[PDB]
């Protein structure tokens, strides 16, 4: 019919705009932002710039979307599958919450609660091949704390040495040992700087390496 030919002609104007919008949204980098709570998530959003807070911070020819699910006080297993096709996952852990106890029940002091969450995000079946970026947030604050108190209230099996650069051989390696999928992911690790380059340049450098190794698994070479 005449009018049915102008409804078909309209639907492929709909179709070529659902295709144009969907090839401009495969060139975007999606990034979950998880963490323990007061763990420096609010700091690195201020660097890289009521439900989801989708932060879009397109900075070096590559368009980033960062989704802070912070105030989703609900069951995480019920909405985490929405982020299945996601490029990386930015995870913040407070270094100064080593001997600092959590305010909940005086349990293991606020970093075995971070490590409990990291083991739930690494080994999650939606994140079998989504390589997690790790941030270690309060680098300045625990150095003043590691001189006052040793790293035994959290890890009593540690070596010792009370040193600022010692805790990389305690804290960072303890989190990268929780990666049960050691062959399909990578747990790119960082210490959160207070400069404008070396905390978002790492997010750009270590998300290209997700993209390169996603192409090699797509182009057969991996």
């Amino acid at each position: 019919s005449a009018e049915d030919k102008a409804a078909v002609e309209r639907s492929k104007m709909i179709d070529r705009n659902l295709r144009e919008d969907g090839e401009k949204a495969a060139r975007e980098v999606k990034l979950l932002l998880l963490g323990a709570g007061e763990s420096g998530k609010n700091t690195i959003v201020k660097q890289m710039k009521t439900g989801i807070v989708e932060t879009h911070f397109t900075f070096k020819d590559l368009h980033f979307k960062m989704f802070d699910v912070g105030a989703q006080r609900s069951e995480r297993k019920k909405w985490i599958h929405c982020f299945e096709g996601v490029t990386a996952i930015i995870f913040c852990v407070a270094l100064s919450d080593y001997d600092l106890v959590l305010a909940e029940d005086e349990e293991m002091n606020r970093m075995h609660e971070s490590m409990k969450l990291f083991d739930s995000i690494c080994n999650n079946k939606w994140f079998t091949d989504t390589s997690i970026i790790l941030f270690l947030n309060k680098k300045d604050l625990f150095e003043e704390k590691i001189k006052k108190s040793p790293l035994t209230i959290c890890y009593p099996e540690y070596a010792g040495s009370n040193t600022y650069e010692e805790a990389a051989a305690y804290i960072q390696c303890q989190f990268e040992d929780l990666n049960k999928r050691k062959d399909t992911k990578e747990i790119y690790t960082h210490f959160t700087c207070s400069t404008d380059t070396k905390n978002v340049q790492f997010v750009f450098d270590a998300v290209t390496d997700v993209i390169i190794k996603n192409n090699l698994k797509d182009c057969g070479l991996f």
């Binding site: 409804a7 309209r10 705009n17 919008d21 989801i52």
Partner: peptide
């Protein structure tokens, strides 16, 4: 339009995360 598979409207949403 389920009869002719042709799209009557496509509505862009403000948040992608729509359940």
């Amino acid at each position: 339009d389920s009869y002719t598979t042709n799209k009557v409207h496509a509505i862009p949403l403000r948040s992608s995360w729509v359940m």
